[PDB]
Scaffold this active site. Structure first.
Site, PDB file in Angstrom:
ATOM      1  N   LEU A 250       0.839  -1.114   0.173  1.00 16.23           N
ATOM      2  CA  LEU A 250       0.195  -0.077   0.049  1.00 16.23           C
ATOM      3  C   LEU A 250       0.872   1.046  -0.032  1.00 16.23           C
ATOM      4  O   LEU A 250       1.897   1.298   0.741  1.00 16.23           O
ATOM      5  CB  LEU A 250      -0.887  -0.221   1.171  1.00 16.23           C
ATOM      6  CG  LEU A 250      -1.815  -1.211   1.336  1.00 16.23           C
ATOM      7  CD1 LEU A 250      -2.988  -0.810   2.417  1.00 16.23           C
ATOM      8  CD2 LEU A 250      -2.760  -1.549   0.299  1.00 16.23           C
ATOM      9  N   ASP A 251       0.282   2.186  -0.522  1.00 19.91           N
ATOM     10  CA  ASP A 251       1.158   3.604  -0.496  1.00 19.91           C
ATOM     11  C   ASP A 251       0.878   4.427   0.610  1.00 19.91           C
ATOM     12  O   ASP A 251       0.242   3.979   1.588  1.00 19.91           O
ATOM     13  CB  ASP A 251       0.343   4.374  -1.791  1.00 19.91           C
ATOM     14  CG  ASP A 251       0.758   3.938  -3.181  1.00 19.91           C
ATOM     15  OD1 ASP A 251       1.877   3.664  -3.650  1.00 19.91           O
ATOM     16  OD2 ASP A 251      -0.159   3.064  -3.662  1.00 19.91           O
TER      17      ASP A 251
END
Ligand SMILES: CCCCCCCCCCCCCCCCCC(=O)OC[C@H](COP(=O)([O-])OCC[N+](C)(C)C)OC(=O)CCCCCCCCCCCCCCCCC
Ligand SMILES: CCCCCCCCCCCCCCCCCC(=O)OC[C@H](COP(=O)([O-])OCC[N+](C)(C)C)OC(=O)CCCCCCCCCCCCCCCCC
Ligand SMILES: CCCCCCCCCCCCCCCCCC(=O)OC[C@H](COP(=O)(O)OCCN)OC(=O)CCCCCCCCCCCCCCCCC
Lengths: 87, 70, 177, 459, 101, 128
Positions: A41-42
């Site tokens: 995930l960012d």
């Protein structure tokens, strides 16, 4: 008014919210799964996750503590510390 | 279930002062009120009357209540 | 700006804080859930369009114009959480947060109502006064010469001793006393 | 008046022959007995004053001040016995002796029929207070405070002595009962102008007037608690009593010679209340509030109308009681935290709730909450000044707004908010402090039921 | 160098430590409780209560009630005979000699 | 574009609109590190005096004593009479006194002149 909280209920609710996220496969996440590494995930995904947990529990997590909440166990421990549970 | 201790400052000394103040006020307040009631009921107040001819009153005979005359 | 452990705010921290503020204010303007979801996705697309930019001056100018854009389009009064600062119930219970050192001034007549609690308090105080010298000796040898650089405290390295400066952050009053 | 003088001087062998531990008990007990005895002065008549002898008399103006003095002495004995705990026994007896001597001079001052005897007692009151301030004060600048206080009073009061002796030589008597019937108009000249200045400047300094008030936030601050109580409660009212007695000889020159001091005292109370808004010291804030209220009394005496005189004497008594209570509360905070800074110890209502209630009551009486006698005096002075001129209502309304502002600022800063974290020696309130607060409060609240005994000689 | 010889500042004494029943009057408990009794008795029970009782029953303070009674008498007497209730001049103009001009 | 935020005395410029916030030069980083070091050293001193189990009193703050001494006991030693101080003193000291004196004198002269001609209605005025 104001029903009490426990670690089991906090963990169940936080895993419920994280399970309703479309970007996380629900059969893979756990209580100590990381966000950048174990889930891919960012940082914006982490910010949106933190905002979702704030909306779920109804209290605001400050940014200087929000940047360090990286796995569901730390979110559980932060909420448990802020709301003073198991007294 | 789930009763927590409530931390509060020591309220013993304030209550002790209030109890002492009430007791020492009432210790003479109750007898004075009882005495004033008994003065009012049994002795009673004076009645206004014209001065008899040739008679001079004392200086305390110009007041109505017994306590004021005393 | 004002940080306990750091002297500055990084570029990524500024971008994330701007993203959270913009999304909260957009939620304030767009009170319905579906409308907020749509415009949040539009804002997320706008933020993801310039994600892969390596020019530092161009990223800085993008951040500056984004902050100007946010200040032009902020809500006059956004949604604040009830316990958040500026909220309606912020610092409401501070009148009930009596510190724990007031229990040492209690009369013995009212101390007899809680025998076991005061026994536990006595053993807690014994533990604190036993561990204080050890924890200040640990803190003395870990601070570099010239004073500490940040405000972070070290943990307890060995077994048996408690972390240094632990009393007033463990015995703090509850949120609802 | 010998039935009150003789027990007061008999208090001296009582404190000099008591045991090492029974001086406070004996002195407090017997002073309270004489304070109870002082109620016999209320035999006042609608036409004649209560004239005892050639030297002493007591009308309806001096009687409330006498009762206030004789009641205030045991309060100072109760207040001053905690910070003198570790003192030498001989020094403790000397302190109590100075208090007794000051009370003797004060009760001989208000009853003096002759004006030069009033002057002699009124300047004999200087020595015990100066000694108390400069000896038992806690700070460095108590010596400077004593110098300022002494020299302001003496520089103001020496022309008063010269003018009083001139009045004695010209009129033939300084007896106040004679001068009521032998008085003459004072015409407009330069000689009479300087007569008015000489007769008025001593009491303008002692009250104090705005511009001559520089000694007050020093003497009221570096004094001990008993000194501050007797300075705020009684000693400021010697000037008021002096102007009430001496204005009889200064007519009709007062009607235009009173203009500059009316402008000084009308504008001065705004300045002192604004100073109170931005004070970092609690004791200094109470002292400046005293300056503002005494400026109100100055205006009331100077416009010389019946309503103004009644408001002036009621306001004098009420401000004496209120200022004494406020100084006592500030002293209790000082004993707890060992600092006079207002921002240091905060949020004490969570720790000291009944003391917070006493603080609230003192603040409420400070801003003249009706029907307290504070409001009665302030209201009567406001009515009389409105009769004087109409823009005085603008000035009085501004003063009332700022007075409420700084009183509630005092209360909110000291009692409300979050408590100070690092202060952990906040002991519970003693019975002695609570008894002192209640003995300041209960007469003040009871006097609202019968306010006619504090309304001066022209009620 | 080292300064002049002087004792350090003594620690403040807590009166509630050795005596939890302290009223704050004295360090000896007997003197303290007797001072409390003296102040509470002779201050509240004696001075305040009997002082309020004395002030409440003052014998016609400053003749106000007598003035009201005499005003009633004078108003009745003047109203019965058609006299004006009050005149503009306090003293008789007959017994006053104005200066000649 | 967007209307530029002009700061005022009572409305400061926001920290997100300050052009000096985004500075990355090493002098500003050194300054921020030095400020953090001073703050952390002072916090360490305070917390050492704060968490002592054997302390029962007031952790004295020299900054507060410094502030009160500067607010009270330094003004006259650091005062020099010059044009600015004398001008402000004459403006704020004798200005309002003269203004209110002339206002009240004019009003009382007008009232006293109207009274003596019997032009002022004083029919029920017997309280003064
Ligand atoms: C706290 C600081 C301020 C203090 C201010 C004190 C008051 C200010 C004015 C005081 C004037 C001096 C006393 C005057 C007494 C007058 C009595 C009298 O009979 O007057 C009529 C008499 C009239 O004289 P006579 O009565 O002998 O003559 C008969 C009358 N005629 C004239 C008609 C024939 O006045 C005088 O004799 C002169 C009065 C003026 C004196 C001027 C000198 C003093 C100037 C002021 C000094 C103020 C203190 C300075 C120091 C301050 C501290 C460092
Ligand atoms: C005096 C000058 C010096 C000042 C300082 C003095 C310090 C020393 C103190 C010595 C003792 C005290 C002296 C002053 C005493 C004053 C009091 C006094 O005697 O008053 C006499 C007054 C006299 O009243 P009176 O004059 O009307 O009585 C008529 C006269 N006789 C009795 C002869 C017929 O007493 C009262 O007014 C008492 C009335 C009854 C009691 C009160 C009933 C109502 C109470 C309130 C009810 C609820 C209302 C709503 C509340 C809502 C919530 C807030
Ligand atoms: C500083 C601290 C803060 C303040 C503290 C108090 C300070 C002020 C105290 C004194 C104030 C001044 C004295 C009172 C003046 C009242 C008005 C008055 O009468 O002024 C005199 C005079 C008025 O003129 P006129 O009426 O013609 O005089 C003839 C009188 N036979 O006026 C004039 O002719 C103008 C002035 C002439 C000089 C007067 C000098 C003597 C008075 C001051 C001493």
């Amino acid at each position: 008014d104001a029903p009490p909280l426990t670690l089991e209920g906090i963990k169940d609710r936080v895993l419920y919210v994280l399970k309703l996220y479309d970007k996380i496969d629900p059969e893979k996440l756990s209580v100590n799964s990381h966000f950048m590494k174990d889930l891919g995930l960012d940082s914006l995904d982490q910010v949106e996750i933190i905002m979702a947990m704030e909306d779920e529990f109804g209290f605001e997590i400050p940014d200087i503590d929000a940047e360090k909440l990286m796995c569901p166990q730390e979110i559980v421990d932060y909420i448990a510390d802020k709301k003073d549970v198991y007294e | 279930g789930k009763r927590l201790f409530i931390i509060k400052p020591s309220g013993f000394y304030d209550k002790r002062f209030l109890k002492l103040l009430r007791f020492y006020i009432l210790l003479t307040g109750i007898p004075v009120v009882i005495g004033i009631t008994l003065i009012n009921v049994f002795i009673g107040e004076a009645e206004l009357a014209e001065i008899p001819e040739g008679y001079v009153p004392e200086h305390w005979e110009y007041f109505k209540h017994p306590i004021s005359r005393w | 700006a004002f940080l306990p452990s750091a002297a500055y705010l990084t570029h990524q921290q500024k971008v994330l804080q701007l993203y959270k503020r913009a999304l909260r204010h957009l939620e304030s303007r767009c009170v319905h859930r579906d409308k907020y979801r749509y415009f949040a996705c539009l804002l997320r697309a706008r933020f993801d369009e310039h994600k892969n930019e390596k020019d530092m001056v161009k990223a800085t100018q993008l951040l500056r114009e984004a902050e100007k854009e946010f200040w032009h389009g902020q809500h006059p009064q956004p949604y604040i959480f009830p316990e958040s600062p500026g909220g309606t119930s912020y610092e409401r219970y501070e009148c009930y947060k009596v510190p724990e050192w007031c229990l040492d001034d209690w009369h013995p007549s009212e101390k007899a109502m809680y025998p076991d609690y005061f026994a536990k308090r006595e053993q807690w105080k014994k533990l604190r006064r036993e561990s204080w010298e050890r924890e200040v000796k640990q803190l003395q040898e870990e601070t570099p010469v010239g004073g500490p650089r940040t405000e972070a405290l070290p943990p307890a390295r060995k077994q048996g001793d408690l972390p240094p400066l632990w009393w007033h952050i463990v015995t703090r009053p509850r949120e609802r006393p | 008046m010998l039935k009150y003088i003789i027990p007061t001087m008999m208090l001296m062998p009582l404190t000099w022959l008591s045991k090492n531990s029974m001086i406070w008990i004996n002195t407090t007990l017997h002073s309270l007995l004489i304070s109870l005895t002082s109620l016999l002065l209320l035999n006042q008549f609608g036409d004649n004053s209560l004239n005892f002898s050639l030297t002493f008399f007591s009308d309806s103006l001096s009687t409330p001040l006498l009762i206030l003095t004789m009641w205030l002495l045991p309060l100072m004995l109760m207040a001053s016995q905690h910070h003198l705990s570790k003192e030498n026994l001989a020094r403790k007896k000397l302190f109590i002796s100075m208090l007794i001597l000051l009370q003797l001079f004060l009760i001989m001052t208000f009853t003096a029929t002759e004006l030069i005897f009033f002057y002699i007692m009124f300047e004999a009151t200087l020595v015990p207070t100066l000694i108390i301030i400069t000896r038992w004060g806690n700070q460095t600048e108590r010596l400077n405070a004593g110098l300022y206080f002494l020299f302001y009073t003496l520089a103001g009061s020496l022309p008063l002595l010269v003018a009083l002796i001139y009045i004695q030589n010209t009129m033939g008597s300084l007896n106040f009962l004679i001068l009521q019937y032998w008085v003459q108009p004072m015409p407009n000249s330069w000689s009479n102008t300087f007569m008015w200045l000489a007769c008025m400047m001593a009491f303008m300094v002692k009250m104090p007037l705005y511009g001559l008030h520089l000694w007050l936030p020093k003497a009221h601050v570096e004094a001990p608690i008993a000194g501050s109580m007797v300075l705020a409660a009684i000693l400021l009212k010697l000037g008021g009593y002096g102007m009430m007695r001496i204005t009889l000889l200064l007519n009709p020159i007062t009607d235009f010679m009173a203009y500059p001091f009316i402008m000084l005292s009308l504008w001065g109370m705004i300045m002192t209340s604004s100073i109170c808004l931005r004070q970092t010291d609690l004791k200094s804030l109470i002292a400046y509030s005293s300056v503002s209220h005494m400026a109100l009394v100055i205006v009331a005496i100077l416009i010389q109308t019946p309503w103004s005189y009644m408001g002036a004497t009621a306001l004098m008594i009420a401000h004496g009681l209120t200022s004494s209570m406020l100084f006592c509360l500030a002293n209790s905070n000082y004993e707890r935290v060992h600092s006079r800074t207002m921002i240091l110890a905060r949020g004490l209502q969570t720790l000291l709730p009944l003391m917070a209630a006493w603080w609230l009551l003192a603040s409420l009486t400070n801003l003249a909450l009706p029907p307290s006698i504070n409001l009665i005096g302030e209201l009567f002075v406001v009515m009389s000044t409105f009769s004087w001129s109409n823009i005085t209502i603008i000035l009085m309304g501004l003063n009332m707004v700022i007075t409420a502002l700084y009183s509630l600022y005092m209360l909110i800063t000291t009692q409300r908010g979050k408590h100070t974290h690092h202060i952990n020696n906040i002991l519970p309130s003693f019975t002695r402090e609570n008894a002192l607060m209640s003995l300041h409060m209960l007469p003040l609240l009871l006097l609202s039921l019968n306010p006619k005994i504090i309304l001066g000689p022209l009620y | 160098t080292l300064r002049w010889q002087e004792d350090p500042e003594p620690e403040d004494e807590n009166l509630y430590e050795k005596n939890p029943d302290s009223h704050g009057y004295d360090k000896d408990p007997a003197v303290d409780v007797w001072n409390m009794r003296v102040v509470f008795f002779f201050g509240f029970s004696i001075v305040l209560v009997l002082g309020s009782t004395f002030v409440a029953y003052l014998p016609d303070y400053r003749m106000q009630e007598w003035a009201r009674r005499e005003a009633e008498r004078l108003v009745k007497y003047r109203e019965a005979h058609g006299l004006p209730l009050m005149e503009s001049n306090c003293f008789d103009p007959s017994k006053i000699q104005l200066p000649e001009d | 574009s967007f209307p530029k935020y002009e700061p005022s005395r009572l409305a400061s410029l926001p920290t997100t609109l300050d052009p000096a916030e985004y500075d990355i030069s090493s002098e500003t980083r050194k300054a921020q590190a030095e400020r953090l070091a001073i703050r952390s050293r002072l916090k360490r001193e305070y917390q050492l005096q704060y968490n002592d189990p054997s302390r029962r009193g007031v952790v004295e703050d020299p900054a507060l004593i410094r502030w009160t001494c500067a607010r009270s006991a330094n003004v006259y030693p650091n005062f020099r009479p010059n044009t600015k101080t004398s001008l402000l003193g004459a403006l704020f000291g004798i200005g309002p006194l003269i203004f209110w004196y002339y206002v009240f004198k004019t009003d009382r002269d007008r009232k006293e002149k109207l009274i003596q001609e019997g032009k002022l209605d004083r029919t029920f005025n017997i309280s003064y």
